[PDB]
């Protein structure tokens, strides 16, 4: 039940391809 | 470019079915409301006379 430093608590805490490959047909 | 443009151009002509599709119903819903003018201005081929 001691206190921790502060400075130690701030320191521990597939829609690629449906346009492919209509890109490459058209 | 060209792969785009007459792939574009066949969609443009995919709006020209439409288009005529809304006119030719102009050409229809205009007609009884001018119909709704004859059957009134036909009254006062009878009035005026009187």
């Not at chain 2, 006119?23 to 009134?40: A, G, H, N, P, R």
Request: aromatic fraction near 4%.
């Amino acid at each position: 039940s001691l206190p921790i430093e502060d400075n130690y608590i701030r320191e521990v805490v597939s829609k690629l391809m449906e346009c492919v490959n209509d890109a490459v047909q058209t | 470019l060209g792969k785009v443009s007459d792939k574009s151009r066949e969609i443009s002509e995919k709006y020209i079915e439409e288009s005529q599709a809304i006119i030719q119903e102009l050409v229809k819903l205009t007609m009884e409301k001018l119909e709704s003018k004859f059957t009134k201005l036909c009254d006062l081929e009878t009035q005026l006379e009187m």
